Design a binder for these strands. Structure first.
Lengths: 145, 203, 94, 178, 96
RNA sequence: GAAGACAUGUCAGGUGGGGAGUUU
RNA sequence: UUGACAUUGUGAAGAGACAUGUUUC
RNA sequence: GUUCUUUGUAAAGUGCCUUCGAAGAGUCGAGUUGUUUGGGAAUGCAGCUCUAAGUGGGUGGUAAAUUCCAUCUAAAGCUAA
RNA sequence: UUGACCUCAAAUCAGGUAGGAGUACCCGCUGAACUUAAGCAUAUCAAUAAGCGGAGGAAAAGAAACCAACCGGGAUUGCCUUAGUAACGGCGAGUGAAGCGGCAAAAGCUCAAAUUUGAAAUCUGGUACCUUCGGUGCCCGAGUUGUAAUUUGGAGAGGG
């Protein structure tokens, strides 16, 4: 699509005496990790998605806390590849919306409201307990007796 | 972006968040071989500032190297000399473990040039480092003015000659009066200062 | 024996002394005789001892009764008195 | 006291090539001049005052003009380097006399050089193999030969003694003040 | 201002000090808004290290002097121990 | 299966003609 | 051969000391 | 020098106002041990332990506390003579 | 049930590189003794002899977390000088350079750290052509865990 769009823009500029503004303003999901982080702290992003399977967890441990500090809707979504397929990449580990058409505003608002009740509310309480209290089946059976 | 979050967080090595990750990763590396290739750098912030670029021609390798003093390679520690030279257990191996790891990975990666390395973990019996290497055979590196300089043969086995960041530190290559004995080469300086200059017209 | 001096760079102790006997020799010979004949306070010669590499002026001889404007970093007690008696002024420079 | 209790014989070097090295340097200079035919083979250097008071009395040539000096001279550091003017960003300017002398030197150098247009048609150059020769370093005059005698009876030697004494007891004086 | 003589508290030749422009390299120490925010975020995420926890406990229970000595023993540099104790006290006060 | 925060790199104390230098 | 320092995690009671969750055997 | 294009209607520079200015962490540094230097109450290098902040940090050849002052910005890299 | 992401394997896969010799010079590791102190262990020999690893016509170093305390010097390296001085050393044998000054030669700089987000604009490889140390059109792949442009503190950047 980029090739056709570039050809159309070049034609409209060279022969159409346009000013490169003929093409409509685009709408796409912002996905760059550095780009997404920079978009945050400016309160421009409307929604943020986080992949939980990031092997270098340090890359994304701070993102939920930073989003909570900035009060931006953030969601942890299973699978980094699913985000990649959504963005025409192998993996992205992050996804965020910046500009959305008015038609999808209501659905976006409902999704943001649901996400806030899913993750944002639990932020204040999830930070004060420790997981990983699981044991093997054999050990559990032996100790239960 | 995430540059400062990664860098500052890595500095809090004593934090509970980093303690669990270190405990998991040291065991994970122990379950692996002494030398193995890391698919992607575990510390992008550290590697990125060391000159690493996420493109074809850059390779990340992980190596495990033992720690402690170096035992003299003699039978029963007998140095067969003056009493002062009989010390064996206290030999300190004046080359840092990072340099040894870089040399070992370069030997295993002779076709790649050791660019730099950074610490990633430690253990009571072993130490862990991550080495960034550049392939001069790749046309991308050769065609890139920012990295084609390493393609020159003068850079062959940089880690072996102590031309790396850690190697230069071990050589004491720094400006100022504190590094006079090694400002411009310890052996070269010793040879120059011990030379008996005699011009045609003796002064 | 005595107190030690770590990193005793010699630049600190550059204080070459000039005797009053050789003080008058700094003026060029082309004008030394004229100044000795035209001895007066109106056009007294100026001898910048620092330009000649002399740090402290010391009195050993007896300069003639000629007013000479002497500039130096240091001067001895007797040297300044002798210069003033000769009619000169001991200026200080750095 | 002779330091010859080592294998010094293995490190003895005799400068037999003194004449040969001189010839090579002269030949190398001519070769570069042929390569550097349009230019004077060197970059103009600034006027500098030395540290180490034993030598501060004598003016010395510097590594390159400061950024402030180049800006005051009416050009830019990048253009200055291509024109043949040495630039030193590390050197600071905290002396009006030296800065003015360097600015005047830069103006004279600019007014004395001819820059051929990049579009060719450059006339005969007739280079000069030394830019420093055309702008020799001159020691500023410290004072005139003769001056009218004036005095105040301050006993300059007494002034030196007072200055020496004051610096010694200043610390003790300040403590005694309280 | 130099006195103009070879000795004294201000010995040296009198010159018109131009006071050159301030070198930017001196500004490396100066903090930045982004760095401050990132450091605060990382500090709140990580919390206090075990030695910092012991230092704050010692400050609360036995005063700063013993805490300062412990910090010097740990950090080695006494000058940095003062800053460590100051930041620990600031953290303690932040609780209330 | 046994065992387990115990065993298992750096300093310090002990023993050490098993081994090296030197004196008589 | 012995002591100390990291490898040394996670669990109750008694012993206590703080704070409004932490430390010792 | 000559000849084929007009390179581009693309890049770079300078002046003033305004808001910023990110600059390298198992690193600096300290204790101990070994080696080394003319480096001396410890010049440099190395094993173990502790382990830092950003108007901060290094140096300022005598250890330590207090308060100023002078110069640079380490833990990244290339480069002929 | 099907297709993806991450890791790890097999390829006599397509395109590549490494060993080794030489080693006077260089860059590091490792490393003694004879001798000397008329004995000898600190020490000297020596940060040398031997051994090991790494390249080139030079190598290294190189644009200061430097030197100075000055009316400031201003990449690195070499010669004279400093200077057989400070200093070190059962203060004994003996060891021992640096700042300033004169000359030899002169060159600068660039990576991370910025959201291009109204457009991954980057690049390896395969294919057809061509003016073949490469360029063009097309197609896979690398790449958002960051490939293009700008900036490196001397400065520099968003706006007017």
């Amino acid at each position: 699509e980029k090739k056709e769009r570039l050809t159309k823009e070049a034609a409209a500029v060279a022969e159409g005496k346009s000013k490169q503004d003929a093409s409509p303003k685009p709408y796409a999901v912002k996905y760059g990790l550095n780009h997404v982080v920079a978009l945050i702290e400016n309160k421009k992003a409307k929604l943020v998605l986080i992949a939980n399977d990031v092997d270098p967890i340090e890359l994304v441990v701070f993102l939920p806390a930073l989003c909570k500090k900035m009060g931006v809707p953030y969601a942890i979504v299973k699978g980094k590849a699913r985000l990649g397929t959504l963005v025409n990449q192998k993996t992205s580990a992050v996804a965020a919306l910046t500009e959305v058409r008015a038609e999808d505003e209501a659905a976006l608002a409902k999704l943001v409201s649901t996400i806030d009740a899913n993750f944002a509310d639990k932020y204040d309480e999830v930070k004060k307990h420790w997981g990983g209290g699981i044991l093997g089946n054999k050990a559990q059976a032996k100790m239960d007796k | 972006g995430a540059y400062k979050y990664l860098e500052e967080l890595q500095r809090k090595k004593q934090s509970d968040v980093l303690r669990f990750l270190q405990r998991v990763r040291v065991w994970e590396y122990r379950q692996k071989n002494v030398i193995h290739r890391a698919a992607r750098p575990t510390r992008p912030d550290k590697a990125r500032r060391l000159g690493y670029k996420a493109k074809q021609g850059f390779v990340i390798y992980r190596v495990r190297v033992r720690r402690g003093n170096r035992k003299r390679p003699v039978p029963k520690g007998a140095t067969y000399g003056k009493p002062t030279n009989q010390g064996v257990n206290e030999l300190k191996y004046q080359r840092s473990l990072r340099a040894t790891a870089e040399e070992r990975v370069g030997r295993r990666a002779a076709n790649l040039r050791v660019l730099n390395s950074y610490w990633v973990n430690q253990d009571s019996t072993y130490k862990y480092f991550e080495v960034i290497l550049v392939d001069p055979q790749h046309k991308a590196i050769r065609r890139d003015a920012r990295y084609n300089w390493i393609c020159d043969p003068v850079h062959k086995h940089r880690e072996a000659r102590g031309l790396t960041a850690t190697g230069k530190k071990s050589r004491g290559i720094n400006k100022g009066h504190k590094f006079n004995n090694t400002k411009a080469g310890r052996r070269k300086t010793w040879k120059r200062q011990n030379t008996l200059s005699l011009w045609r017209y003796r002064k | 024996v005595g107190m030690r001096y770590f990193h005793k760079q010699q630049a600190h102790f550059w204080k070459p002394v000039l005797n009053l006997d050789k003080l008058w020799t700094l003026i060029p010979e082309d004008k030394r005789d004229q100044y000795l004949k035209s001895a007066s306070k109106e056009t007294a010669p100026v001898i910048d001892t620092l330009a000649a590499g002399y740090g402290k002026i010391l009195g050993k001889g007896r300069i003639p009764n000629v007013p000479v404007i002497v500039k130096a970093r240091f001067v001895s007690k007797l040297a300044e008195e002798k210069i003033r008696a000769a009619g000169g002024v001991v200026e200080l420079i750095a | 006291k002779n330091h010859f209790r080592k294998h010094w014989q293995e490190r003895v070097k005799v400068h037999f090539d003194q004449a040969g090295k001189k010839v090579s340097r002269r030949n190398a200079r001519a070769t570069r001049a042929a390569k550097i035919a349009p230019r004077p083979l060197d970059l103009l250097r600034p006027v500098v005052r030395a540290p180490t008071v034993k030598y501060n009395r004598k003016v010395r040539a510097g590594r390159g003009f400061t950024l402030a000096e180049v800006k005051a001279a009416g050009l830019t550091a990048a253009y200055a380097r291509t024109i043949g003017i040495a630039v030193d960003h590390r050197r600071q300017n905290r002396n009006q006399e030296i800065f003015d002398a360097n600015v005047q030197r830069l103006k004279e150098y600019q007014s004395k050089i001819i820059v051929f247009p990049r579009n060719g048609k450059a006339p005969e150059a007739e280079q000069v193999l030394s830019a420093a020769a055309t702008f020799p370093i001159a020691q500023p005059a410290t004072d005139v030969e003769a001056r009218a005698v004036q005095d105040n009876g301050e006993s300059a030697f007494r002034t030196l003694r007072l200055a020496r004494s004051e610096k010694k007891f200043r610390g003790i004086r300040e403590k005694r003040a309280r | 201002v130099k006195t103009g003589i070879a000795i004294g508290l201000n010995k040296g030749k009198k010159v018109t000090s131009m006071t050159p422009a301030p070198k930017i390299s001196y500004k490396k120490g100066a903090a930045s808004n982004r760095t401050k925010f990132v450091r605060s975020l990382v500090r709140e995420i990580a919390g206090l290290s075990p030695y910092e926890r012991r230092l704050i406990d010692l400050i609360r229970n036995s005063g700063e002097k013993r805490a300062r000595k412990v910090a010097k023993k740990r950090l080695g540099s006494f000058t940095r121990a003062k800053a460590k104790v100051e930041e620990m006290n600031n953290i303690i006060a932040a609780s209330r």
